[PDB]
Amino acid sequence: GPHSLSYFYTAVSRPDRGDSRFIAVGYVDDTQFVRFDSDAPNPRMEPRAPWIQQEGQDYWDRETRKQRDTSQTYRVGLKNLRGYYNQSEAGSHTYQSMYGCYLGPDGLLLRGYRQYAYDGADYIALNEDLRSWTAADTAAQITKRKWETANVAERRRSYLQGLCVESLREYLEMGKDTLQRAEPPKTHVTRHPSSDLGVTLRCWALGFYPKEISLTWQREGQDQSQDMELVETRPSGDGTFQKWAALVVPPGEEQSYTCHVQHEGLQEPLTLRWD
C-alpha cells in the first residue's frame, strides 16, 4: 500500500454562457484535502481536510496563483481542442487531467503519472519513463509536437520526482493521525427475499479506510463471483467507505456459503456466514 498524492482537473466549456468552468481537487491516498473552483467569486485554493489548515498564507497564495493560471490555460485550451476535432460552438466539451506520485518504500518516487482526456477519451499521456509522450490521435500529435518543442516532459519529471514526493511526505506527517491509520471494516451478513430461485445473502463491509478492499463469496472452497452482485465502493460521508456483495442461494443452503473480506486494517481476512 504505497501512499500517493494526486490532483484531478476538470474543465468544461459552457456555450450558453460563453465561458468555461475549471474544477481541481487534490487527494492524499483516498482523502480529499484541497479544492479550487473557477466559478467561486475571487476563487482560491481552499482546504478540504483539517490537517491542511496549518499551511500558512504563503502556501494558499502560491497554490491559488498556480490554479488561477491553470484555469485560464485550460479555458483557452478548450477552444484549441474544438478546432482540432472539427466541432461547432453549439455543444459543451470536457477536458480532464490527472497527475500524481506514489511514494516507494525507500522514500523515492515509485510511479509518477500525468495524463489527459478530451470528451472522456484518452488524449495524451506521459510515458512511464517520464521523458516522452504518447498521443492518441492526430489532434493529440499537434499538442505532442508543441510539448516536445518546449521540453515540457523534463519539467513534469522534475515535479513528479521532486516537489510531488516531498510534499506527499510532508502531508503524511501533518495528517499522520488520520492518513496513516487503517480502519478495518465492520462486517455482517443479512438475508433478503429474492424470487423463486432462492434467497439473497448480502455481505457488508462498513466504515473502513483506505478504500481498497476485497469481498468474495465462496461455496465449499470455490469462488462465486459468477453470480454475485458487487456494488461500487462508496463513501460513508465521514472519510471512510462502504461496500457489499450479494448472491442468491437456494433456500435452506445459506450455511454452505461464506463471505471473505480482505482489508489492510485486518491481520487476516475475515470469514463470515449467515447465522
Binding site: 502560491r62 497554490e63 493560471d69 485550451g77 484549441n80 481542442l81 489527459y116 513534469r156 510531488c164
Partner: peptide, 9 residues
Amino acid sequence: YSSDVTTLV
C-alpha cells in the same frame, strides 16, 4: 503542492 507546469494544449 500542485504542479506549476501548465502548458497550453
